[PDB]
Amino acid sequence: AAYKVTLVTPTGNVEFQCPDDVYILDAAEEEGIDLPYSCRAGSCSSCAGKLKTGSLNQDDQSFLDDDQIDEGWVLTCAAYPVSDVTIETHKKEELTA
Numbered sequence: 731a732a733y734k735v736t737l738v739t740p741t742g743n744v745e746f747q748c749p750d751d752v753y754i755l756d757a758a759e760e761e762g763i764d765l766p767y768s769c770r771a772g773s774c775s776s777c778a779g780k781l782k783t784g785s786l787n788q789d790d791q792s793f794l795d796d797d798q799i800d801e802g803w804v805l806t807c808a809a810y811p812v813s814d815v816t817i818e819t820h821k822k823e824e825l826t827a
């Protein structure tokens with residue numbers, strides 16, 4: 731149905747409810763949150779975050795390798811929450827292979 735998203739952003743924590751059928755980024759936008767993005771199509775590092783707690787569905791993304799996913803990397807424009815989750819945002823500059 732919908733779940734609780736906690737985002738840890740540079741300027742502060744913010745929470746909001748997100749339907750299992752809406753991407754994290756879009757939901758955040760809708761609540762009035764400004765998150766970084768560029769392509770909006772899952773093929774770049776711009777909207778990257780690090781999943782701290784919880785599960786996500788990242789099938790629509792195509793840029794990260796299985797290893798990176800395993801490391802806990804997430805592309806917020808292409809991720810659906812499958813449970814409540816905590817995510818650290820604005821991590822593009824920390825990404826490595």
Ligand code: FES
Nearest residue numbers: 768770772773774
């Ligand atoms: S903005 Fe490019 S993958 Fe999300």
